[PDB]
Write a protein that binds this ligand. Structure first.
Ligand SMILES: O=c1ccn([C@@H]2O[C@H](COP(=O)(O)OP(=O)(O)O)[C@@H](O)[C@H]2O)c(=O)[nH]1
Ligand SMILES: CC(=O)N[C@@H]1[C@@H](O)[C@@H](O)[C@@H](CO)O[C@H]1O
Ligand SMILES: OC[C@H]1O[C@@H](O)[C@H](O)[C@@H](O)[C@@H]1O
Ligand SMILES: [Ca+2]
Ligand SMILES: [Mn+2]
Lengths: 123, 272
């Protein structure tokens, strides 16, 4: 499902400030990463990235195409293509704690300025 | 004759835009008798200072093109523009390269006429209010500001995709567009970066006048999201000096002059 900025913001509220990344920055990051589409599936080539957060089967989730994956998040990648974001967020938090924000390549180029546009005033 | 007025007296404002009824180009020609071979139109009423070349990046979207021609020809004549339509068709089956085809449009249209404005438009976007003039302004213009696909709101302030317009001098100033973005995404953000580096800002109509519809479609095969797009847009400042109009190479396989448009098929290779 293609969610809106505010729907995403409310859903991921519990991630605001973690590892120093704000909700405005995340709103910006996820739009450029998946267009806020919870069913987004993108080939990176050799690897595949899934859902809102575009979590890769290379190291983070286990897919059918790559079963021998490290599966650091301990979850099937199919659980990352639905509208229940709790498990997606738990995995993103592991990536942030281990690798950091640089996993999300859109951060530096698209979310280093003009962050106020990403605010959701709908509480 | 004298100069066309500042705002055209023929404008109707808001329009119902729908894609349910089949389109017959023969009917479209019939309804637009004033359009000459090659899809060229010039007011016989007054002299327009806007000599506009409209460039459309293309590959396997013929059904979309039909609706585009059906709706835009009448609109543009109403806006009293001295224009020409150019469809730049990518030959082959390699990754689609939108930005490079737009560069081809700029160079090939200049061979036909002394154009001073270039409107770059995707094939699937139709404006919903004819007050959203398809011409150039004193600063680079972003035209499709409120797409129904984004809830009639701009997705982000730095967005320059869909439909935009650059005067000839604005285009020359940024060394045109990038040639090395293959697959979906990022090339419009790179163009936005180039304009900012040259000290320009983006001009836009308000969201009511800029309302636009995009024909519903799934992603095209061979235009999958580009993995290197984020690394590329992060280095625009250095690549814009050597990648653009000054490094553009391509091969023309065919030039077609139909009554409603000119279609140029080209081989633009692959990304470096
Ligand atoms: O196979 C393709 C891919 C792209 N395009 C052109 O490239 C533009 C960018 O298109 P796309 O609609 O895929 O992306 P969007 O604007 O919807 O993100 C299109 O509208 C077309 O004018 C095309 O003609 N054929
Ligand atoms: C969604 C929309 O209306 N426009 C654009 C389109 O012009 C092109 O830039 C593309 C990426 O290749 O992304 C988007
Ligand atoms: O679809 C809207 C925009 O989304 C951005 O994330 C992409 O980088 C642009 O190329 C695209 O035009
Ligand atoms: Ca989930
Ligand atoms: Mn489209």
């Amino acid at each position: 499902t293609e969610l809106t900025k505010c729907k995403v913001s409310h859903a991921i509220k519990d991630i605001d400030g973690y590892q120093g990344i704000s909700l405005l920055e995340w709103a910006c990051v996820l739009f450029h990463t998946s267009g806020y589409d919870t069913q987004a599936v993108v080939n990176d080539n050799g690897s595949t990235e899934y859902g809102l957060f575009q979590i890769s089967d290379r190291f983070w989730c286990k897919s059918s195409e790559f079963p021998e994956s490290e599966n650091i998040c301990g979850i099937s990648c199919d659980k990352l293509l639905d509208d229940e974001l709790d498990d997606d967020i738990a995995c993103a938090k592991k990536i942030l704690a281990i690798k950091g924000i640089d996993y999300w390549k859109a951060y530096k180029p698209m979310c280093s300025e003009k962050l106020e546009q990403w605010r959701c005033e709908k509480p | 004759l004298t100069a066309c007025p500042e705002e055209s007296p023929l404008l109707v404002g808001p329009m119902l835009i729908e894609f349910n009824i089949p389109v017959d180009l023969k009917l479209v020609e019939q309804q637009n008798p004033k359009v000459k071979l090659g899809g060229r139109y010039t007011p016989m009423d007054c002299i327009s200072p806007h000599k506009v070349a409209i460039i459309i990046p293309f590959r396997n979207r013929q059904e979309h093109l039909k609706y585009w021609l059906y709706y835009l020809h009448p609109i543009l004549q109403r806006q009293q523009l001295d224009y020409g339509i150019y469809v730049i068709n990518q030959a082959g089956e390699s990754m689609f390269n939108r930005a490079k085809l737009l560069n081809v449009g700029f160079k090939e249209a200049l061979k036909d006429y002394d154009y001073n404005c270039f409107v770059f438009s995707d094939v699937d976007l139709i404006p919903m209010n004819d007050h959203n003039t398809y011409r150039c302004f004193s600063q680079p213009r972003h035209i499709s500001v409120a797409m129904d696909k984004f809830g009639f709101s701009l997705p982000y302030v730095q967005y320059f995709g869909g439909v935009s317009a650059l005067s000839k001098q604005q285009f020359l100033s940024i060394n045109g567009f990038p040639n090395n973005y293959c697959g979906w995404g990022g090339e419009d953000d790179d163009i936005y970066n180039r304009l900012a580096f040259r000290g320009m800002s983006v001009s836009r109509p308000n969201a009511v006048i800029g309302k636009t519809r995009m024909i519903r479609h799934s992603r095209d095969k061979k235009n999958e999201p580009n993995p290197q797009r984020f690394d590329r847009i992060a280095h625009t400042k250095e690549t814009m000096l050597s990648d653009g109009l000054n490094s553009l190479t391509y091969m023309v396989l065919e030039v077609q002059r139909y009554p409603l448009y000119t279609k140029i098929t080209v081989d633009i290779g692959t990304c470096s």
